[PDB]
Amino acid sequence: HEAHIKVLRGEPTPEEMAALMAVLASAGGGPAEPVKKERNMWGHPVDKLRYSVFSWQRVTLLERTHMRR
């Protein structure tokens, strides 16, 4: 059920196929280890704001920002 690369017009020889795939694999740049980054809420912007003592954003912005995981 994976999405495969497709070649739509012409057929390359095995040498041309290897060169095409090899250069595209080289173009596959990135982190080399893509995973969920370490959470660190220290000094998050939502703690910096002034909230009125009765402001509903204390629920729907501040708390949800801290508690969401």
């Binding site: 994976e2 690369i5 497709k6 196929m17 795939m21 694999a25 080399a32």
Partner: peptide, 18 residues
Amino acid sequence: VVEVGGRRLEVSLPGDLA
């Protein structure tokens, strides 16, 4: 895996290019 015009084709690669 690569498809070419309706062929399935397998290509093997070093787990090393980055």
